[PDB]
């Protein structure tokens, strides 16, 4: 579960420190490791979207879902948005040094929003499931 794989590919993603706790408002860093062994390099780009995902359910469940999506959207901000991971040559590894800062205290277990787009087949793998950020 913590180790997240990519569909229709062989690449692999893993946070070196998947569990981190830090005071709110202090920028922190996460080292995202990429393992590539398929055939060829890639140009995958990582980005965090701070937009409320539209909701599709009773009013209680509907508002629970909206609160969850709001906290996901405007809780954490990635200070290297639309980053271009340069090259990941075959049978080699690489570290994407992501930088964040939290603004809304909470427990962002398996944080969504952080999703990495592969610019070879338009993959939208949810790489952010291997994170357990806890900002006070």
């Amino acid at each position: 579960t913590s180790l997240v794989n990519s569909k229709l590919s062989n690449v692999k993603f893993k946070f070196i420190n998947s569990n981190i706790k830090v005071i709110k408002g202090e920028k922190f860093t996460m080292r995202l490791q990429i393992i590539n062994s398929s055939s060829s390099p890639l140009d995958l780009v990582v980005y965090y979207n701070n937009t409320i995902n539209p909701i599709p359910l009773t009013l209680e469940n509907q508002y629970q879902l909206h609160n969850k999506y709001r906290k996901i959207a405007e809780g954490i901000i990635l200070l290297s948005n639309d980053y271009k991971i340069p090259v990941v040559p075959p049978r080699e590894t690489y570290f994407a040094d992501l930088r964040f800062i939290g603004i809304m205290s909470g427990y962002y277990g398996t944080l969504s929003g952080l999703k990495v787009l592969d610019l070879n087949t338009n993959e939208l793998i949810e790489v952010g499931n291997g994170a357990s950020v806890l900002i006070q």
Partner: protein, 168 residues
């Protein structure tokens, strides 16, 4: 019909140019000097006017405003107006030249807000000699070109808002 003697300008030199070529760092504003001399030996000019007119003001068809919304119309036309007025400008130009006088005047090239197709500049001047106090002024034309190239520098390609929720 016979007109009196008319003058001529030669473009003796320009200070920081090489055959009217320059580079701009897309946000910095510079200036340089222009030197011209009146070839005529008898009478000189009593009227100078500078009207720069670059490529983009030259390379927009007369009907651009027909089918566009008000907001983009305002944005583009504000850019055009600023480029017409507050762009490359003259400071401390002369008002009377003398025969065979090599006069020099300054020129401030300010491009803090120009688009990424500003590759061209066609400063044209119309000096003239007042007639013999009869009814008119005899104008001329001179259309010196400049080929300035604009580099690229810091640019913002995206935005967000994300309002605050909790005090720190």
């Amino acid at each position: 019909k016979i007109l009196p003697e008319q003058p001529q300008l030669e473009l003796l030199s320009t200070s920081k140019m090489t055959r009217n070529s320059w580079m701009m760092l897309d946000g910095t504003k510079t200036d340089f000097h222009i030197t011209v001399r009146n070839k005529s030996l008898s009478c000189a000019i009593n009227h100078i006017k500078i009207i720069p007119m670059n490529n983009i003001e030259q390379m927009l068809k007369p009907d651009y405003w027909k089918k566009m919304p008000p907001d983009d119309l305002y944005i583009m036309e504000k850019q055009l107006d600023w480029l017409s007025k507050s762009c490359v400008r003259i400071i401390k130009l002369p008002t009377v030249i003398k025969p065979n006088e090599t006069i020099t005047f300054d020129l401030e090239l300010d491009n803090t807000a120009v688009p990424f197709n500003f590759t061209g500049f066609d400063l044209l001047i119309e000096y003239g000699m007042s007639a013999t106090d009869e009814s008119c002024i005899y104008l001329k034309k001179l259309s010196i070109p400049y080929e300035v190239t604009l580099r690229r520098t810091i640019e913002v390609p995206s935005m967000d808002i994300i309002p605050l929720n909790e005090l720190f």
